[PDB]
Design an enzyme around this catalytic site. Structure first.
Site, PDB file in Angstrom:
ATOM      1  N   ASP A  90     -23.436  37.235  18.799  1.00 34.12           N
ATOM      2  CA  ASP A  90     -22.948  37.052  17.444  1.00 34.12           C
ATOM      3  C   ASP A  90     -23.860  37.783  16.461  1.00 34.12           C
ATOM      4  O   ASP A  90     -24.835  38.438  16.843  1.00 34.12           O
ATOM      5  CB  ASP A  90     -22.845  35.563  17.120  1.00 34.12           C
ATOM      6  CG  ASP A  90     -24.175  34.857  17.231  1.00 34.12           C
ATOM      7  OD1 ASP A  90     -25.196  35.549  17.394  1.00 34.12           O
ATOM      8  OD2 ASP A  90     -24.209  33.611  17.163  1.00 34.12           O
TER       9      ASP A  90
HETATM   10  C1  LIG Z   1     -41.642  27.931  10.560  1.00 32.69           C
HETATM   11  C2  LIG Z   1     -40.489  26.985  10.337  1.00 32.69           C
HETATM   12  C3  LIG Z   1     -40.137  26.793   8.887  1.00 32.69           C
HETATM   13  C4  LIG Z   1     -38.803  27.371   8.498  1.00 32.69           C
HETATM   14  C5  LIG Z   1     -37.621  26.700   9.154  1.00 32.69           C
HETATM   15  C6  LIG Z   1     -36.819  25.828   8.222  1.00 32.69           C
HETATM   16  C7  LIG Z   1     -35.528  25.311   8.801  1.00 32.69           C
HETATM   17  C8  LIG Z   1     -34.529  26.382   9.144  1.00 32.69           C
HETATM   18  C9  LIG Z   1     -33.095  25.932   9.074  1.00 32.69           C
HETATM   19  C10 LIG Z   1     -32.463  26.058   7.702  1.00 32.69           C
HETATM   20  C11 LIG Z   1     -31.344  27.049   7.665  1.00 32.69           C
HETATM   21  C12 LIG Z   1     -29.979  26.448   7.831  1.00 32.69           C
HETATM   22  O1  LIG Z   1     -29.723  25.562   8.611  1.00 32.69           O
HETATM   23  S1  LIG Z   1     -28.782  27.175   6.767  1.00 32.69           S
HETATM   24  C13 LIG Z   1     -27.248  26.820   7.660  1.00 32.69           C
HETATM   25  C14 LIG Z   1     -26.951  27.895   8.675  1.00 32.69           C
HETATM   26  N1  LIG Z   1     -25.569  27.860   9.123  1.00 32.69           N
HETATM   27  C15 LIG Z   1     -24.548  28.377   8.431  1.00 32.69           C
HETATM   28  O2  LIG Z   1     -24.655  29.420   7.790  1.00 32.69           O
HETATM   29  C16 LIG Z   1     -23.236  27.626   8.489  1.00 32.69           C
HETATM   30  C17 LIG Z   1     -22.063  28.525   8.780  1.00 32.69           C
HETATM   31  N2  LIG Z   1     -22.155  29.124  10.104  1.00 32.69           N
HETATM   32  C18 LIG Z   1     -22.297  30.427  10.303  1.00 32.69           C
HETATM   33  O3  LIG Z   1     -22.213  31.252   9.393  1.00 32.69           O
HETATM   34  C19 LIG Z   1     -22.512  30.899  11.738  1.00 32.69           C
HETATM   35  O4  LIG Z   1     -22.152  29.857  12.646  1.00 32.69           O
HETATM   36  C20 LIG Z   1     -23.912  31.462  12.074  1.00 32.69           C
HETATM   37  C21 LIG Z   1     -24.300  31.089  13.510  1.00 32.69           C
HETATM   38  C22 LIG Z   1     -24.975  30.876  11.140  1.00 32.69           C
HETATM   39  C23 LIG Z   1     -23.931  32.985  11.946  1.00 32.69           C
HETATM   40  O5  LIG Z   1     -22.569  33.497  12.027  1.00 32.69           O
HETATM   41  P1  LIG Z   1     -22.046  34.111  13.422  1.00 32.69           P
HETATM   42  O6  LIG Z   1     -21.400  32.979  14.197  1.00 32.69           O
HETATM   43  O7  LIG Z   1     -21.061  35.199  13.045  1.00 32.69           O
HETATM   44  O8  LIG Z   1     -23.295  34.645  14.089  1.00 32.69           O
END
Ligand SMILES: CCCCCCCCCCCC(=O)SCCNC(=O)CCNC(=O)[C@H](O)C(C)(C)COP(=O)(O)O
Ligand code: SF4
Ligand code: SF4
Lengths: 87, 80, 181, 54, 165, 385, 140, 112
Positions: free
Chosen positions: A43
């Site tokens: 992906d």
């Molecule tokens: C050192 C550690 C400190 C930092 C870490 C802090 C925590 C990190 C986590 C915070 C970020 C989130 O969760 S932010 C939420 C992230 N998820 C989303 O964006 C929801 C919608 N889903 C999508 O867009 C896709 O499933 C996706 C697989 C993402 C890509 O698309 P593809 O499917 O086309 O690859």
């Protein structure tokens, strides 16, 4: 004598290993002209993680403009072989 | 001879010169007063019975109020 | 400039879509507004000749768990020119960002950081939005009503690691709630 | 009871709050003249002492 | 502006005239009496209202004043008071446990105000520093010991302050 | 630019003071205070207390101006309850508010002086602080956290002979102020440390929510005792000193002049002090006397209710502010009809003043930072809460 | 007639040509406000007080009388307000907040719970006569 | 620099998700130096934990929630690099470096 570029033959295998070692990549579809998205079942999130791995491997940052152009193996190779900070 | 190492006791001995004995408690502590005005008329002191290892907690409750100007009654009047 | 004049003059002069609620009371003249209009209403009141609200006393949040938009953000403002106070309130929820007024009143910067720290409300265009009161790495927003009084973690010195560490709380004697109702 | 702490009959004595000023100093020409006279006469005396030491 | 005012300004600058005044007033307090108290022989002044170490009081017969109403426990802003009670063998309503955590208490006096029988008081003692944390967890017996030791001073203070409360 | 991480860690300067400074050699480019080292969750704790049990939290906010915050909290509760306070109580509350102003200015002025090297005035001023601390102890039994000013009035009446002892203090206090002035005011070193340091314009003061001396230093005539008077401040004569340059030297002169005006107010309170009750008569909000509680069923019931449940406050919300020694101290109180506050937001003047350290100290020498913190008069109990 | 030496307000410079500055600002204001719909209460109120302050400025040649007649602080603070109004005019034109929406609703509460005399209360006193004229002109 | 407005769509949100993941990964060497992890864990394991975190939230469809998650992640990362709270096998909230579960829980306590 001095040099600024890593030999291309030295670059292709280094990009070939890091994709094979990367998970979700069976080391059989990893032809040197492979697309991470289409031919490797990766992906967009997996594709972002691959350019990151190459940056660390060659020790240099890759700009967003060129981070996207690396969608295939052959493309990742050319960029590093001509980039002088790659060492 | 305690005055030489213990300067806190010496200050009390010097301020004792010319003072008036108000009373003695059960432990032997002696209570003095001057009736002047140097610290705004506050001239109540105690000379502890033990010239060494004295401590503030040795003042009995009957004399504690007098010593802290909480009351004008001495420990003797309170006990009576 | 009494509260009678402010209520009447604001009704006549303000654009009608800004203010949804107007309360005139001895407890204080209050203007409730939608979030999308808060910035413009505060710029009007600051610049207009007949209001001249130049001082932002403070910004605070209030948590109302029974409401769809649980957070109420309250702006207490002051006019030294006319010797009058005004309260402007707006509602928010856990995910909707509201506009920052640092460009209008520089004093709002730390107060908006406190609101983010204490309640979790975020502010668009805030130059530096980060927690200001809680310990670094703190989790949660303590002023929310569902946040427990004693929190979730506590610190102690740990000799084997030669440092102060954080662990889940263990209370020798619990807070005793005395329900007097 | 009915006795409460308060002013005495007629009120307390008036108290000052303003800075009371103080004019203490010779100032100006006194110090300059003293220093200049000391310099001149003392330097003459230095000459006399140097002559004796010689 | 004027050669005479310019002259005076220059002389005042060069001869530190205002720095002399600060020296003179500094020296005046050198010879005056001092305000230092010769603790522990001499003490500072306190009042009958002073809020110090808590104590539990008895009636002159020896019976405890406390009847376990728990008003002090309820009003305590620091939640420093813990009480358990039950019917005594003679039918009296008395505590079996009365703890004050002296390290949670804020020494506000609210408990003494709340008590309807003058049982718990903040007495005049302020010199009760300890070497351990556990010595500042006062149980019922320690509190009653404080009352016995300080009763004469506590009773006199209550007589004094009964005209204001 | 190199960064200097300087946190004064003892009574020398505040104690939880922690500053990140960006320097160009010795010139300060940017100042970033890091706060919350004294954040104790006071606002969260107040929501779990009755209105009486939350009162002692106000003594511990600006812990140099204890009674001034008790006044502000009591006024907020009296406002929501519509409670009338007897005249005698109002005079006692104003008398001790101005005593609290002197205690504050004595400490602020002489701790700032000690930080720039003037070690003597601290000692002279703290013997005057002890005399005033004695008056706190004689009325309440505590030297600092009196919890004396309460909703409806004050906790107890003045002990006999207190007003005379306050009068004897006032007779001599002007001389004490004159000695602090003679030590500092005219001294060329003092003036070099404060003149044109930390200049603030009137627009800057309003933009950053400055109040009190920090606002009046810039020539803005604004005192809440005159603009929004409370208690008996309208029956009292006093001047409001204002600055003309807005630097650290004007704010020093204003604080000195404000102690002379506080002395003036205390004299008038002493002379105009009337007889009467010190507590609002209503029998739903004030404790009965000990004799009444022990003799009357109605009084005992009220005493039981007051010290267990506490009074209820009808559902409402309002912002109440007073002229605290450090500036405008405000309380945003939200009542939900119950016996505990639903929300108590505390507006502290030091929160606004410390936020303005960055612009005040810009392009100043490193050693001027402490001078600027001194003129702001920061106590972190109220900054952090 | 005498030139003002100080305004007593730190950072507020004395403006010697305050009369010419104020006339310019008020005249500019009376043109820029015409971009607002004529029925808006903002346009009416702004025209009302800008006209009176302009008429006073035209009549009086001495800034002390201008200050005295208006009763709205020093001429330098009148210039500040005039500049701020011109800035607000520019923002309100760009914002386009005019007009009442279709399904408009507004709750008005007039709570008469009294408060004690002794609690803090702002009592500034009566405003200059023009404020009330502006208000009653807005009501009608 | 300032807090940007709420994302219009999941394309804007995903561009932001990718931007954050890049910043989180690029700080990995700094973290390894601060916590002295050279003999504790591999840098890719740090990368996997970050990408895991992101993949556990792949079912979110509201861009406002995604923005809040990114903001909280950015705040969490800044603390880890600037104000490190060192614990042995723990960086912030990440553990670094024949019977069913019922009978184990039963043996432990009565509260599962
Ligand atoms: C050192 C550690 C400190 C930092 C870490 C802090 C925590 C990190 C986590 C915070 C970020 C989130 O969760 S932010 C939420 C992230 N998820 C989303 O964006 C929801 C919608 N889903 C999508 O867009 C896709 O499933 C996706 C697989 C993402 C890509 O698309 P593809 O499917 O086309 O690859
Ligand atoms: S002094 Fe106050 S805090 Fe301490 S036990 Fe008594 S009521 Fe509780
Ligand atoms: S000490 Fe007094 S208030 Fe406390 S339980 Fe005993 S009788 Fe009741």
């Amino acid at each position: 004598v001095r040099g600024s570029f890593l030999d291309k033959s030295e670059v292709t295998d280094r990009v070939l290993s890091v994709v094979k070692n990367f998970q979700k990549v069976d080391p059989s579809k990893v032809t040197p002209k492979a697309n991470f998205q289409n031919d490797l079942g990766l992906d967009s999130l997996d594709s972002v993680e691959v350019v990151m791995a190459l940056e660390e491997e060659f020790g240099f940052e890759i700009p967003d403009n060129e981070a996207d152009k690396i969608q295939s193996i052959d493309l990742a190779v050319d960029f590093i072989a001509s980039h002088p900070q790659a060492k | 001879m305690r005055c030489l190492p213990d300067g806190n006791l010496l200050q009390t001995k010097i301020h004792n010169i010319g003072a008036t004995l108000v009373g003695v408690d059960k432990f032997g502590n002696k209570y003095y007063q001057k009736l002047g005005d140097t610290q705004y008329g506050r001239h109540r002191w105690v000379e502890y019975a033990s010239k060494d290892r004295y401590n503030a907690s040795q003042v009995p409750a009957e004399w504690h109020g007098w010593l802290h100007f909480i009351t004008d009654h001495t420990g003797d009047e309170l006990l009576s | 400039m009494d509260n009678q004049f402010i209520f009447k003059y604001s009704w006549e002069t303000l654009p009608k879509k800004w203010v949804k609620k107007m309360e005139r009371s001895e407890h204080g003249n209050r203007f409730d507004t939608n979030t999308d209009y808060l910035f413009q209403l505060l710029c009007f009141l600051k610049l207009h000749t007949y209001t001249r609200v130049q001082v932002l006393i403070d910004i605070c949040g209030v948590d109302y768990p029974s409401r769809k938009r649980r957070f109420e953000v309250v702006y207490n403002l002051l006019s030294t020119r006319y010797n009058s106070r005004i309260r402007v309130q707006t509602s928010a929820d856990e995910v909707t960002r509201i506009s920052s007024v640092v460009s209008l009143f520089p004093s709002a910067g730390w107060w908006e950081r406190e609101v983010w720290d204490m309640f979790g409300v975020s502010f668009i265009n805030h130059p530096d939005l980060r927690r200001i009161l809680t310990d670094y790495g703190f989790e949660g927003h303590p002023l929310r009503k569902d946040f427990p009084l004693s929190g979730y973690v506590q610190v102690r010195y740990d000799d084997p690691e030669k440092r102060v560490v954080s662990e889940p709380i263990e209370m020798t004697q619990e807070f005793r709630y005395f329900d007097f109702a | 009871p009915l006795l409460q702490d308060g002013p005495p009959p007629g009120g307390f004595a008036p108290v000052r709050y303003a800075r009371r000023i103080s004019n203490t100093g010779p100032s100006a020409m006194a110090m300059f003249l003293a220093v200049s006279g000391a310099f001149a006469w003392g330097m003459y005396q230095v000459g006399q002492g140097n002559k004796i030491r010689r | 502006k004027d050669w005479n005012t310019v002259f005076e300004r220059s002389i005042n600058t060069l001869f530190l005239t205002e720095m002399v005044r600060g020296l003179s007033l500094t020296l005046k307090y050198f010879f005056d009496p001092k305000v230092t108290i010769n603790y522990p022989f001499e003490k500072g002044p306190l009042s009958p209202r002073f809020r110090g170490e808590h104590a539990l009081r008895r009636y002159p017969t020896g019976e405890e004043r406390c009847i376990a109403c728990k008003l002090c426990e309820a009003v305590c802003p620091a939640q420093a008071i813990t009480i358990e009670a039950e019917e005594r063998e003679d039918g009296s309503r008395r505590t079996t446990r009365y703890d004050i955590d002296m390290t949670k208490c804020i020494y506000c006096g609210f408990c003494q105000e709340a008590c309807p029988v003058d049982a718990i008081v903040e007495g005049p003692n302020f010199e009760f520093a300890t070497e351990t944390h556990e010595e500042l967890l006062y149980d019922k017996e320690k509190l009653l010991e404080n009352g016995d030791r300080w009763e004469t001073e506590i009773a006199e203070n209550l007589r004094s302050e009964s005209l204001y409360r | 630019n190199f960064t200097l991480n300087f946190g004064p860690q003892h009574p020398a300067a505040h104690g939880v003071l922690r500053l990140v400074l960006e320097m160009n050699g010795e010139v300060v480019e940017r100042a970033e205070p890091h706060i919350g080292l004294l954040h104790r969750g006071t606002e969260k704790l107040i929501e779990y207390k009755t209105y009486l049990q939350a009162l002692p939290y106000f003594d511990r906010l600006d812990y140099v101006s204890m009674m001034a915050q008790e006044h502000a909290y009591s006024l907020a509760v009296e406002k929501l309850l519509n409670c009338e306070v007897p005249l005698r109580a109002q005079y006692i509350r104003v008398l001790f508010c101005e005593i609290t102003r002197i205690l504050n200015h004595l400490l602020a002025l002489t701790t700032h002086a000690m930080d720039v090297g003037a070690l003597t005035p601290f000692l002279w001023a703290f013997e005057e602080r002890e005399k005033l601390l004695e008056f706190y102890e004689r009325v309440s039994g505590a030297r600092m956290h009196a919890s004396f000013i309460r909703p409806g009035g004050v906790a107890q009446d003045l002990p006999l002979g207190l007003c005379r002892d306050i009068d004897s203090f006032t007779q001599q206090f002007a001389s004490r102020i004159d000695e602090l002035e003679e030590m500092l005011t005219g001294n060329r070193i003092w003036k070099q440390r404060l003149v044109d340091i930390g200049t603030v314009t009137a627009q800057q003061a309003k933009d950053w929510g400055f109040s009190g001396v920090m606002l009046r230093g810039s020539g803005v005539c604004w005192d809440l005792r005159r603009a929004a008077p409370y208690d008996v401040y309208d029956q009292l004569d006093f001047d409001v000193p204002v600055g003309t340059r807005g630097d650290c030297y004007d704010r020093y002169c204003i604080r000195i002049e404000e102690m002379r005006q506080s002395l003036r107010i205390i004299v008038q309170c002493l002379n105009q002090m009337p007889s009467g009750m010190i507590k609002a008569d209503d029998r739903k909000l004030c404790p009965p006397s000990r004799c009444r509680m022990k003799l009357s069923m109605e009084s005992l019931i009220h005493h039981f209710e007051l010290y267990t449940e506490g009074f209820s406050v009808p559902a409402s919300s309002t912002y109440t502010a007073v002229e605290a020694p450090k500036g405008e101290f405000g309380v945003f109180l939200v009542s939900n009809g119950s016996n505990r506050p639903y929300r108590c937001k505390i507006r502290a003047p030091g929160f606004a003043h410390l936020q303005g350290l960055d612009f005040m100290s810009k392009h100043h020498m490193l050693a001027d930072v402490v001078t600027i913190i001194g003129t702001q008069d920061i106590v972190f109990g109220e900054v952090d809460r | 007639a005498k030139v003002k030496q100080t305004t007593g307000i730190v950072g507020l410079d004395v403006v010697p040509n305050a009369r010419a500055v104020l006339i310019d600002l008020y005249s500019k204001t009376l043109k820029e406000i015409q971009a607002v719909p004529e029925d808006e209460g903002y346009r009416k109120a702004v025209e009302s007080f800008t006209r009176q302050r302009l008429n006073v400025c035209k009549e009086e040649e001495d800034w002390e009388m201008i200050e005295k007649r208006l009763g709205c602080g020093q001429v330098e603070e009148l210039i500040e307000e005039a500049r701020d109004e011109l800035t607000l005019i520019g923002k309100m034109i760009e914002w386009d907040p005019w007009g009442v929406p279709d399904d408009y609703e507004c709750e008005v509460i007039e709570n008469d719970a009294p408060i004690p005399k002794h609690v803090p209360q702002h009592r500034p006193g009566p405003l200059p006569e023009q404020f009330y004229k502006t208000l009653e002109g807005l009501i009608a | 620099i300032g807090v940007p407005p709420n994302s219009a769509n999941l394309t804007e949100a995903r561009r932001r998700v990718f931007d954050f993941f890049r910043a989180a990964c690029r700080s990995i060497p700094t973290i390894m130096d601060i916590y002295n992890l050279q003999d504790v864990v591999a840098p890719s394991q740090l990368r996997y934990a970050i990408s895991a975190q992101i993949r556990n939230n792949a079912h979110i469809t509201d861009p406002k929630v995604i923005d809040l998650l990114i903001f909280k992640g950015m705040e969490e990362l800044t603390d880890i690099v600037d104000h490190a709270k060192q614990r042995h096998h723990i960086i912030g909230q990440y553990v670094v470096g024949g019977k069913t579960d019922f009978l184990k829980n039963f043996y432990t306590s009565n509260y599962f």
